[PDB]
């Protein structure tokens, strides 16, 4: 007959959040249809017709009953009190990732106690590497997503409203009432179908934790939340992408940059050489303004557009660079992120060189060689990135020249120092890094680099590339040369 | 390549030829033994270049070394350009170029 609710990706009045909501509704409807094959089983005889880019809902009787059934089945709470979204395959996902998703939803969408009633703080001790760590999360008893069906329908006639519905920030992220004294009027208003879409928004979007490297991970656990909102091209494509992202381990969702989360959302995507790959997404940063802040606040929104080359480079970086370490202390799983990858992911997202900000983010902002030590662990990733560079092999030639010079400089003292008196590579590399950090302008840095090259003895790579390396040293900015010297130190093979 | 780059490369070649001449002189003077040292000569040149503290001393040493080199065909072909480059440029940059030429030197096989 006539669909009572019709939603399409081609509608001109929709935004990105609306399309993400229709995608979430599509996934939830697919899962419900798998759960309830027959329309008679579903309350109100609600039935749907799902296409690639259209959603149509048919039901009989009162609209309130059917909408309440659909919404109650869509948003559920398990025995432990965690948010149970039937749109996601909850059997396949483990307890830790379910807790992660529940905490992200509670910290991003349900920021306010006016939209959720909290239960007791449930503590569970799951064993990991012969250690039982106690996860403590705030269980829930109700949230507004469950009972928005009352707001969707009229109070008296119990039918779908024919006017606009005033929504709040829990439905549309960033839909804040700027002036609290005008709460009745200055409120964002949406059609009931788009209100249902905004209800189903949280299913598709994914949540990542942002680690600030200035503060030590042990000294404070992360609290900034990143929301990855994808740009929907097709219901089936985004549904498959989300259900594939369900594979990722919980430790991968901790990042140190927005671009890393944006790429991680698309990391599992399969690249087809014949098909022109193009995807886009938005990363929303939620962060407490002060220490005593009661709720998180939207601070920045970053739009990420990724092509085939960016995805391939990020996949190589993930494959070759060190994964996230899982430091496990008393009843706390401190997930140590990899600053290198993050940086590289951010540089790839911004469209700049993958080494653009290595120095002031790796040496200047390093407390006790915490970031410096990871360079020798990510040496293999550095070698792979240099070898598979899309351009600029002259600076790889410079890497070879500098590595030969470092070999000569180190071998001089290592021949001077006998067995036992020989210092490890760590002390000499630290001294070299300090001397590189000493340089403040072009003249001093170039003087030091040239003297180092001379003290390195005969340099075959420099000899074979006299003109090229000489021009590169003379012309290039000294900061870039310092960064490349740093990453040649990192990829130095004794 | 710009004209500044061309003059810089010609100066590098001039310094390399001067080092060739000086090392040949050392080889002729020190034919005795298994083989005259080569790394020690480079270390001596680096130490003497780093000894210079001001423009006058460094340029005096540079001119002395260049003349001790010998014919220096690249200086034959470029009197005015290389002479003006040496006279004008700050001595620190000339020292940087000289040390780059030292590093990028290939001893004759």
């Amino acid at each position: 007959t006539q669909p009572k609710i019709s939603l399409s990706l081609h509608a001109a009045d929709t935004t990105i959040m609306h399309r993400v909501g229709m995608t979430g509704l599509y996934m939830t409807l697919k899962r419900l249809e798998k759960q309830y094959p027959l329309s008679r089983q579903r309350g109100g005889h609600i039935s749907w017709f799902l296409t690639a880019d259209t959603i149509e809902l048919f039901w009989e009787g009162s609209d309130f009953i059917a909408l309440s059934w659909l919404i109650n089945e869509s948003f559920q709470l398990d025995d432990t009190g965690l948010i149970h979204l039937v749109g996601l395959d909850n059997d396949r996902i483990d307890l830790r990732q379910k807790i992660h998703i529940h905490e992200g939803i509670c910290g991003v969408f349900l920021r306010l106690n006016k939209f959720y009633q909290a239960g007791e703080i449930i503590n569970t001790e799951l064993r990991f590497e012969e250690k039982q760590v106690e996860y403590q999360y705030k269980s829930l008893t109700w949230y507004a997503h469950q009972t928005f069906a009352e707001k969707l329908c009229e109070a008296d006639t119990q039918q779908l409203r024919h006017d606009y519905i005033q929504i709040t920030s829990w439905l549309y992220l960033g839909g804040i009432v700027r002036h609290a004294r005008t709460q009745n009027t200055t409120k964002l208003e949406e059609k009931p179908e788009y209100a249902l879409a905004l209800l189903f928004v949280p299913v598709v979007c994914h949540y990542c934790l942002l680690h600030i490297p200035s503060e030590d991970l042990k000294e404070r656990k992360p609290h900034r939340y990143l929301v990855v909102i994808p740009e929907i091209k097709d219901f089936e494509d985004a549904s498959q992408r989300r259900w594939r992202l369900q594979q990722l381990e919980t430790k991968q969702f901790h990042v140190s940059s927005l671009g890393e989360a944006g790429l991680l959302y698309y990391s599992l995507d399969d690249i087809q050489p014949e098909v022109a790959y193009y995807q886009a997404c938005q990363v929303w940063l939620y962060e407490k303004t002060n220490k005593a802040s009661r709720q998180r606040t939207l601070m920045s929104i970053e739009e990420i557009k990724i092509d085939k080359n960016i995805l391939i480079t990020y996949q190589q970086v993930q494959k070759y660079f060190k994964t996230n370490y899982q430091i496990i202390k008393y009843k706390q799983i401190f997930i140590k992120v990899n600053p290198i990858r993050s940086l590289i992911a951010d540089n790839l997202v911004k469209g700049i060189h993958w080494w653009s900000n290595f120095w002031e983010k790796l040496v200047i902002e390093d407390s006790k060689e915490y970031l410096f030590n990871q360079l020798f662990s990510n040496r293999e990733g550095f070698i792979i990135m240099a070898e598979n560079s899309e351009e600029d092999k002259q600076y790889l030639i410079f890497i070879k020249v500098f590595q030969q010079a470092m070999k000569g400089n180190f071998a001089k003292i290592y021949a001077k120092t006998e067995e036992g008196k020989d210092p490890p590579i760590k002390k000499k590399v630290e001294r070299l890094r300090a001397e590189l950090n000493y340089c403040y302008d072009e003249l001093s840095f170039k003087e030091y680099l040239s003297d180092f090259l001379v003290r390195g003895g005969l340099n075959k790579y420099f000899n074979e590339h006299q003109e090229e390396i000489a021009l590169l040293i003379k012309k290039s900015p000294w900061q870039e040369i310092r960064i490349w010297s740093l990453l040649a130190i990192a990829s130095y093979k004794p | 390549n710009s004209e500044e780059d061309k003059q810089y490369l010609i100066f590098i070649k001039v310094f390399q030829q001067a080092m060739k001449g000086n090392f040949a002189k050392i080889y002729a003077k020190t034919e005795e033994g298994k083989d005259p040292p080569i790394k020690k000569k480079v270390e001596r040149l680096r130490a003497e270049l780093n000894y210079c503290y001001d423009e006058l001393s460094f340029k005096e040493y540079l001119s002395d070394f260049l003349v001790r080199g010998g014919l220096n065909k690249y200086f034959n072909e470029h009197q005015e350009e290389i002479a003006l480059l040496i006279k004008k440029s700050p001595w620190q940059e000339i020292r940087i170029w000289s040390l780059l030429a030292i590093a990028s030197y290939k001893p004759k096989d």
Partner: protein, 212 residues
């Protein structure tokens, strides 16, 4: 038919906040048709917004502006007391730097004479006869317009980034804005296609109409 009017715009800084971006000042990459319509009404000194309904506007981006974020201690009406600390909130506002664009004005569908195109042409012909108030700006009142002038189809004779009405487009720009809430705001989906085209394609024209 009379050739559509062409205006060359140059604004050092712009903020076309998103309709739903109230917690953070997110900006549109391209000026929305509603903002351009309001700017033109200010240029001709027309306070009534329903006066020039039916005018069609086409926007061609001469260059891609860069997006930057600036902190701001924006005020709000939260407490009755003006001096209460709750009235001041720190929030980011996204701005666009060095915006250059060409605006096509076509006024065939207007039912009230003189049309907006004729009013703009007359204002540029005799600037001393224009009766308006305030300084011309695009976006926020402090974001003044650097250069607005009558230009031809080839002012930079380069390549143009047009805003094409595509139902699968990324941007959702409004051609009518409800400043109280969002009930009367009307949206259309656009895309930025790189086309040296001097003239606007058929899908690049947006007609400003009332939400009714």
């Amino acid at each position: 038919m009379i050739a559509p009017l062409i205006l060359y715009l140059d604004v050092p800084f712009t903020t076309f906040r998103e309709s739903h971006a109230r917690e953070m000042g997110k900006t549109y990459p391209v000026p929305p048709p509603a903002t351009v319509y309001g700017m033109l009404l200010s240029l001709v000194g027309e306070t009534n917004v329903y006066r020039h309904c039916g005018v069609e506007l086409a926007i061609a981006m001469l260059s891609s502006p860069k997006k930057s974020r600036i902190l701001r201690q924006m005020r709000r009406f939260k407490n009755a007391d003006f001096s209460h600390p709750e009235n001041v909130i720190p929030c980011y506002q996204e701005i666009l730097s060095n915006l250059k664009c060409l605006i096509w004005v076509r006024s065939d569908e207007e039912k009230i004479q003189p049309s907006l195109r004729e009013r703009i042409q007359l204002a540029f012909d005799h600037p001393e006869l224009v009766r308006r108030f305030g300084c011309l700006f695009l976006g926020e009142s402090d974001q003044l317009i650097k250069t607005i002038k009558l230009a031809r189809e080839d002012y930079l004779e380069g390549v143009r980034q047009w805003a094409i009405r595509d139902n699968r487009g990324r941007l959702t720009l409004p051609y009518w804005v409800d400043h109280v809430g969002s009930r009367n705001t009307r949206f259309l989906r656009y895309r930025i296609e790189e086309m040296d085209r001097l003239s606007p394609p058929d899908l690049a024209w947006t007609m400003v109409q009332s939400p009714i």
